[PDB]
Design a protein around this ligand. Structure first.
Ligand SMILES: CN(C)C(=O)[C@@H]([C@H]1CC[C@H](c2cccc3ncnn32)CC1)[C@H](N)C(=O)N1CC[C@H](F)C1
Ligand SMILES: CN(C)C(=O)[C@@H]([C@H]1CC[C@H](c2cccc3ncnn32)CC1)[C@H](N)C(=O)N1CC[C@H](F)C1
Ligand SMILES: *[C@@H]1O[C@H](CO)[C@@H](O[C@@H]2O[C@H](CO)[C@@H](O)[C@H](O)[C@H]2NC(C)=O)[C@H](O)[C@H]1NC(C)=O
Ligand SMILES: *[C@@H]1O[C@H](CO)[C@@H](O[C@@H]2O[C@H](CO)[C@@H](O)[C@H](O)[C@H]2NC(C)=O)[C@H](O)[C@H]1NC(C)=O
Ligand SMILES: *[C@@H]1O[C@H](CO)[C@@H](O[C@@H]2O[C@H](CO)[C@@H](O)[C@H](O)[C@H]2NC(C)=O)[C@H](O)[C@H]1NC(C)=O
Ligand SMILES: *[C@@H]1O[C@H](CO)[C@@H](O[C@@H]2O[C@H](CO)[C@@H](O)[C@H](O)[C@H]2NC(C)=O)[C@H](O)[C@H]1NC(C)=O
Ligand SMILES: *[C@@H]1O[C@H](CO)[C@@H](O[C@@H]2O[C@H](CO)[C@@H](O)[C@H](O)[C@H]2NC(C)=O)[C@H](O)[C@H]1NC(C)=O
Ligand SMILES: *[C@@H]1O[C@H](CO)[C@@H](O[C@H]2O[C@H](CO)[C@@H](O)[C@H](O)[C@H]2NC(C)=O)[C@H](O)[C@H]1NC(C)=O
Ligand SMILES: *[C@@H]1O[C@H](CO)[C@@H](O[C@H]2O[C@H](CO)[C@@H](O)[C@H](O)[C@H]2NC(C)=O)[C@H](O)[C@H]1NC(C)=O
Ligand SMILES: *[C@H]1O[C@H](CO)[C@@H](O[C@@H]2O[C@H](CO)[C@@H](O)[C@H](O)[C@H]2NC(C)=O)[C@H](O)[C@H]1NC(C)=O
Ligand SMILES: *[C@H]1O[C@H](CO)[C@@H](O[C@@H]2O[C@H](CO)[C@@H](O)[C@H](O)[C@H]2NC(C)=O)[C@H](O)[C@H]1NC(C)=O
Ligand SMILES: *[C@@H]1O[C@H](CO)[C@@H](O)[C@H](O)[C@H]1NC(C)=O
Ligand SMILES: *[C@@H]1O[C@H](CO)[C@@H](O)[C@H](O)[C@H]1NC(C)=O
Ligand SMILES: *[C@@H]1O[C@H](CO)[C@@H](O)[C@H](O)[C@H]1NC(C)=O
Ligand SMILES: *[C@@H]1O[C@H](CO)[C@@H](O)[C@H](O)[C@H]1NC(C)=O
Ligand SMILES: *[C@@H]1O[C@H](CO)[C@@H](O)[C@H](O)[C@H]1NC(C)=O
Ligand SMILES: *[C@@H]1O[C@H](CO)[C@@H](O)[C@H](O)[C@H]1NC(C)=O
Ligand code: NA
Lengths: 728, 728
């Protein structure tokens, strides 16, 4: 009898998914790491050579965390002493290796504790942030030019984001943008002077006698936000003037009237930069397009080139206003915008005309624009077979919009329905990344004729191994409610028999624009639960979910904690009605927004669920950050949406928890969803006399991803579920 | 057939013990609160009169927390707006009611947020502390004199103790000492300027958007300690035009050489005061005896009247050097000190003589000196029947030490073997409080011929109720380990049948000088476990325990976490050999020091225990405070006792928890044994891959005593124990 996929298999990663991560260095070559040495491949023929022998730095004295070759291939940036900070930020030491003369640079070295470093887009200039100020090096071995002098720990951030801009606005730590050929360096400056601090203890190693108090400028809903300023400096003048002037580009008067955010920066040409602002009440965005005035050294943004977006049935964009993709001459651009029917499609704009032209349409959505050439625009969408959970690459002829070719749909329709892509520098070649429903498949293609060049990685090794395992199957389908279809997926135990009653675990997330029913292949906790414990693990995308139009996505606008919670309960009822579910054993679990929904469901009094597990849950929206929360909830004030803020807390449903088995889990150093959120849930339960299970994870954050903690939480949750389902 | 003592009975206090808390106001009368009314009783005949009507303050407008009548009976201090701080500290608002003119005082009232207040010992002067400074009021309606002006929150403490002196040294917030007739007011001043701060989050009500960070000057082992100065001020010569002058009494030179503490202050006469200082290495104490010099208005402490105490086998005193008990003329005093055999007995000192004479002796110990007259010294000891866990009142004839009379031993030997006493002002009368093995019994007696005047409270009402309940019994016995007897107690289930095998729960504390095997009657969690769940709850006093001599108590000197832990395993090992114990179901639990020992035991790899519960445990001695920790462990430096500090942590034994079920509980706002201690335990268990159960209690301190948390924890622990013992 074949063995099953066990918890240890999952926690020990015995069945490794292979991938093929390459880095395009030009329009025909990419770097690939093999046997620890860096190889360089010729896309056209597939041949290669050793770019950097794995022995080059065997005596460097440190373990290199990552590397980075300058655009002109003359230098390599070595990163070490990596110290993670938030989701994207981290600190590290850096050294530069001169590839030509094959030597390490020992003078004018990048400072220790550098917060961020980036090569210019061309050549080998370097811009970095250290002690919250920006510095530029024209040559790797020469002295740096100081660009800002205002940097101040936890107060003024130049070139880097503060906590909330990192996590919610830019999804990146850097706040600097080189112009195309590297002449100009644009950057933002954040001022968190009056932003309140979240404070929590960090215990560290046992040797630390007194716990440390971590203090981070973090604006909770309705609190004082950081303010921001934008500047551009001409780096080509640095070696000619003692102190190059950073020219500020101010936000439009429509933004200065109140609190606002800088939500996008995209260079259009060597002398044209576009930037976008968003009002704190995120239903109005303004994009400015600014040209360099070579006679005044200033930047001017013609109001005739200003573009505005306004919210209709909800907020603006999926998670932020959409980014612009400029044609080469910088005189027009494309943005994904929801059309009159509520579906997000590509709209083509002339920089000085306010009305754009939709070039795609249909009851489906464009996921992203991937590349743009003089003749074609390439994008990913879920048009194929009307499956919102599928993803394919398409190419549209710019001179004839009726000519749309799907590049990935038919390659291997049964094995591949979820694609991501990576084009070479000028889109001459592209690597396709198939992630499901079958095993991941990586292929390389020629753009000139859209012909497959060769398979890069097919996971044949893993496929061989999995043949000796009773793997679970995955079903993706929909149910119709109120004449609209909602998708769901089920991870089904091996040899699934529909005449039997299986216990069911509802795996939920359900945040705004979320998607938990898709065609991606995953090896995770649910795999073990289905394969070894014979538990059906399901997920449902109800109101509030994404990629299916505004009608569904905006249903929870200003109403978090309502429909997305109820649809999850209704989903469970619908699943039991399918007849292969044991009504006495229906559980529910989620992490993050999933923890919030799980708790709301467990405290709803529905009686449908026997037990549930919430990991790092939000419990009351006033505890979460301003940018994310206010986008969907507005402000927590009586003149706006306070009533719903107070009506959507987990705490107010404490008494109903007497009807279920609850397990609450949270990392104590969670900088994102503060441990505070679960501390208030537990106290509310204690106050009404409800018994429950709990687990805190010392010094773990929102990912509870350290090796030991990861294994410990899934082991702990496994016992809770098996116990709840009376499983040996 | 009748009901058992249930968990709800314990949690809802269904069965309550009646008390008789009286307040002696002279040598002939005492105050007693009845029907919310304050009555005055004549000890001789038992007749009384109403002293204060319960309705007198029906329109006071504030809920009165407590009251304090001035010594002369003329005034009553009304305490309200009570806000708890640490174990003894709290702030409150006060009002003074004139009992002669039956009127509330409205002029010059005590400020709000007063930290401590106290009447002079005679008459009606007042001394209080506010904003860390001392104030004196000669009359309740007159303006107060400012005594100190250096008071500074968390830095300078005048008249009140800082965290460590409150908890570990004086067991009181107050640091003011009135002379016998109220003329002088002595006080200590603490300086915490360089004491590190423990920091932890306080979440508060749900409405608080950002958690608050509590910061408390708290010296952990080896850290910088607060410094102290001592002053005496004449309150009969205060001026409303000039600032009060405080006379300092510097510590002796042998103390000023290094870090030290003030550990006792005791007035001997109207013009003689004694002080005792202890070196930071708590093995050397120096008592000074100072006289007021009318000529220079200074206080002189003759070196000839200096008394030194040194420790050979361990530290000095049980928890601190013993207090002196001066005769009427203040020329000699009595103090409990360990004799040459290591047994604590009463020693008679001459103020200008180095050697003291022991007046009691034997293989037992004097627990405390209770009253002194020219003819007799009254004290409590565990001499009767050689039972270290029993307590009786004795009097010894000062003119003939061979004449010792037990005053409580034979009153009711079956019901009463544990007494406490309260003497009237000049020891003319005494109230005996019997607390076990039977129901509490309170009686009044006259000293002249030791007549038993009357029964004040006999709990006959509770006795009648308990007759309808299947109550457990208590067996107190001993086992012999290496020629030494060690005592234990077992709470046995109703109808105990020695032919059956019962599961056993070892209830442990085991800290230095602890005693968990005694004759006290208690209604607690163990009562329910034995009565309703038929679980035997045992406690054992092994090496390190108190009241049995230094040989036993000092066995763990400089070695906490060794013998006291080993002896608990040995006792369980023995209990498990008895015919009535189920060796497959032996558990262990403890709180505080008890949590540390339980964790050390569960991590010992002994295999004797199936499961255990640790509530707010200490996990590594460097996390606990200096005064308590260094007393038993010395300093955590390589030259002193660092290796043992490092070998005695719970964390180093994590791997051994693989074969036991462990439940770890801790309040997040524990200012005493910081949540840090458990946070480090949980991390070590996660690091070795050991699963366990946990529960944190939001905003609860070391007592986890709020009504809801109390009920929640015992409910959660009860489910854990039953589950471990397979009890329905
Ligand atoms: C799902 N996920 C990772 C998130 O929602 C987090 C981010 C992710 C990037 C988004 C985001 C921001 C800007 C561009 C962009 N393009 C795609 N996403 N995206 C903005 C939301 C969120 N901050 C969070 O941690 N919680 C935690 C509890 C509450 F549920 C929200
Ligand atoms: C039992 N108990 C309440 C204590 O031991 C606490 C105090 C009580 C007064 C004592 C004390 C001090 C001065 C005189 C005196 N006379 C009698 N006791 N006593 C000194 C010890 C201790 N600070 C503590 O909380 N922990 C917590 C974990 C570690 F176990 C010690
Ligand atoms: C991949 O192989 C090709 C062809 O073999 C290599 O092309 C070289 O190109 C240079 C520049 O035009 C010529 O001077 C050489 O003669 C070519 N070499 C050969 C063998 O034909 C190319 O360098 C290889 N690329 C890698 C990364 O190995
Ligand atoms: C960051 O913002 C703060 C405002 O919150 C600025 O601080 C003010 O600066 C002015 C001018 O120096 C002072 O008069 C105010 O008293 C300051 N207010 C506060 C609250 O500090 C600060 O200058 C800004 N810093 C930068 C670099 O822009
Ligand atoms: C480079 O120019 C900037 C911009 O003026 C200088 O920054 C100013 O410095 C002065 C004095 O230190 C401050 O009063 C101003 O508020 C600063 N303005 C800004 C925008 O920071 C900076 O000091 C100059 N650096 C050098 C070396 O001269
Ligand atoms: C990058 O683009 C910049 C901006 O267009 C170029 O700089 C200009 O170059 C022209 C000469 O063709 C000068 O007359 C202008 O004064 C320059 N403008 C500025 C702001 O410096 C620059 O030459 C380009 N760099 C490269 C390597 O092509
Ligand atoms: C409390 O005791 C003090 C000190 O013995 C008494 O004050 C002394 O009284 C005598 C006699 O009147 C004077 O000669 C001294 O000068 C006083 N000494 C001081 C320091 O004041 C005081 O009278 C007593 N108070 C009561 C109520 O008995
Ligand atoms: C207890 O009883 C005595 C009477 O035996 C009370 O009376 C004594 O004190 C009274 C006021 O203090 C006087 O009015 C009596 O004359 C006096 N009698 C004697 C014989 O001394 C006494 O007050 C009572 N005490 C209480 C608290 O009620
Ligand atoms: C309280 O103690 C501090 C020291 O812990 C006293 O200040 C001293 O220490 C300072 C360093 O913190 C030195 O810089 C000072 O010179 C030294 N003396 C003074 C007067 O500050 C402080 O005075 C003490 N306060 C009181 C009221 O005694
Ligand atoms: C301490 O605070 C209390 C409450 O503020 C003060 O008591 C009175 O409070 C009322 C309102 O509740 C005010 O109108 C009065 O002015 C306050 N004083 C009096 C005498 O009524 C109290 O005054 C404060 N303590 C002191 C010493 O002033
Ligand atoms: C009081 O206890 C201390 C600490 O144990 C003793 O001081 C020294 O302790 C070290 C161990 O840390 C020993 O090696 C020394 O022999 C001790 N003496 C000295 C002078 O350092 C101290 O001796 C004890 N005092 C008494 C009277 O027993
Ligand atoms: C590169 O280093 C690896 C060690 O990670 C070694 O196994 C391999 O043989 C080296 N590459 C070559 C081509 O030898
Ligand atoms: C970084 O710090 C290390 C350790 O202090 C030091 O030896 C090294 O020279 C530093 N590097 C730079 C570039 O300053
Ligand atoms: C802008 O947002 C506010 C608050 O959400 C709303 O009242 C207003 O109607 C919105 N305007 C538009 C054009 O959507
Ligand atoms: C005082 O109040 C209590 C209840 O608070 C009441 O029962 C009692 O009768 C009152 N005292 C008197 C003397 O009536
Ligand atoms: C008393 O001392 C304080 C603080 O030193 C001072 O401010 C005040 O003026 C003094 N009053 C007199 C009468 O000296
Ligand atoms: C005596 O018993 C103790 C425990 O009570 C043990 O540690 C010791 O080794 C035994 N022998 C001696 C000589 O103390
Ligand atoms: Na009697």
């Amino acid at each position: 009898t074949r063995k099953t996929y066990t918890l240890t298999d999952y926690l020990k990663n015995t069945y490794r998914l292979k991938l093929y991560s390459l880095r395009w260095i030009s329009d025909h070559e990419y770097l690939y790491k093999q046997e620890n040495n860096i190889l360089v491949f010729n896309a056209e023929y597939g041949n290669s050579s050793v770019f950097l022998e794995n022995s080059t730095f065997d005596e460097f004295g440190h373990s290199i965390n990552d590397y980075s070759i300058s655009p002109d291939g003359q230098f390599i940036l070595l990163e070490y002493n990596y110290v993670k900070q938030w989701r994207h930020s981290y600190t590290a030491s850096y050294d530069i290796y001169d590839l030509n003369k094959r030597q390490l640079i020992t003078e004018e070295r990048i400072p220790n504790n550098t917060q961020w470093v980036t090569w210019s887009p061309v050549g080998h200039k370097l811009a970095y942030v250290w002690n919250n100020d920006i510095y530029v090096k024209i040559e790797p071995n020469l002295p740096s030019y100081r660009i800002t002098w205002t940097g101040k720990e936890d107060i003024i951030y130049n070139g880097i984001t503060d906590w909330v801009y990192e996590e919610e606005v830019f999804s990146a730590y850097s706040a600097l943008w080189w112009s195309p050929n590297g002449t100009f360096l644009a950057y933002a400056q954040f001022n968190d002077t009056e932003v309140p601090l979240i404070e929590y203890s960090f215990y560290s190693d046992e040797s630390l006698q007194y716990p440390k108090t971590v203090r981070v400028p973090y604006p909770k809903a309705g609190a004082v936000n950081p303010t921001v300023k934008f500047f551009v400096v001409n780096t080509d003048s640095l070696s000619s003037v003692t102190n190059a002037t950073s020219i500020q580009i101010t936000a439009p008067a429509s933004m200065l009237i109140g609190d606002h955010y800088l939500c996008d920066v995209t260079w259009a040409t060597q002398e044209r930069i576009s930037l976008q602002w968003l009002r704190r009440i995120q239903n109005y965005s303004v994009m400015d397009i600014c040209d360099y005035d070579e006679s005044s050294g200033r930047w001017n943004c013609l109001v005739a080139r200003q573009h505005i977006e306004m919210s209709t049935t909800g907020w603006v964009g999926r998670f932020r206003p959409s980014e612009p993709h400029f044609t080469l001459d910088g005189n027009s651009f494309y943005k994904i915008i929801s059309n009159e029917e509520g579906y997000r499609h590509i709209c083509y704009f002339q920089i000085d005309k306010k009305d754009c032209t939709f070039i795609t349409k249909g009851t489906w959505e464009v996921i992203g624009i991937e590349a743009l050439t003089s003749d074609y625009l390439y994008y990913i969408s879920n048009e194929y077979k009307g499956m919102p959970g599928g993803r394919n690459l398409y190419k549209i002829q710019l001179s004839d919009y009726t000519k749309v070719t799907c590049l990935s749909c038919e390659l291997n329709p049964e094995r591949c329905q979820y694609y991501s892509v990576s084009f070479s520098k000028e889109a001459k070649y592209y690597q396709l990344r198939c992630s499901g429903p079958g095993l991941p498949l990586y292929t390389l293609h020629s753009s000139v004729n859209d012909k497959g060049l060769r398979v890069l990685e097919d996971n044949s090794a893993l496929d061989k191994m999995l043949q000796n395992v009773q793997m679970p199957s995955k079903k993706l389908d929909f149910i119709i409610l109120n004449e609209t279809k909602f998708w769901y997926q089920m991870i089904l135990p091996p040899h699934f028999d529909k005449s039997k009653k299986y216990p069911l675990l509802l795996d939920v997330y359900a945040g705004p624009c979320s998607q938990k029913a898709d065609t991606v292949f995953r090896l995770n906790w649910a795999t073990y639960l289905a394969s070894t414990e014979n538990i059906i693990v399901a997920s449902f995308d109800g109101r509030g979910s994404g990629y299916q139009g505004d009608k569904i996505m905006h249903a929870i606008n200003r109403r978090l904690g309502t429909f997305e919670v109820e649809d999850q309960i209704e989903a469970a009822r619908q699943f039991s009605k399918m007849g292969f579910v044991d009504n006495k054993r229906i559980a529910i679990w989620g992490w993050s927004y999933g923890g919030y929904v799980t708790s709301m469901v467990l405290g709803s009094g529905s009686g449908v669920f026997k037990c549930g597990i919430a990991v790092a849950p939000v419990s009351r929206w006033e505890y979460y950050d301003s940018v994310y929360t206010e986008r969907y909830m507005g402000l927590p004030t009586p003149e706006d949406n306070l009533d719903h803020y107070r009506n959507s807390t987990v705490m107010s449903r404490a008494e109903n928890f007497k009807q279920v088995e609850y397990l609450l889990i949270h990392g104590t150093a969670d900088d994102n969803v503060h441990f505070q959120q679960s501390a208030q849930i537990s106290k509310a339960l204690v106050d009404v006399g409800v018994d429950f299970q709990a687990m805190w994870y010392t010094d773990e954050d929102h990912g509870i991803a350290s090796s030991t903690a990861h294994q410990h939480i899934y082991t702990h949750m496994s016992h809770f579920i098996k116990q709840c389902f009376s499983l040996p």
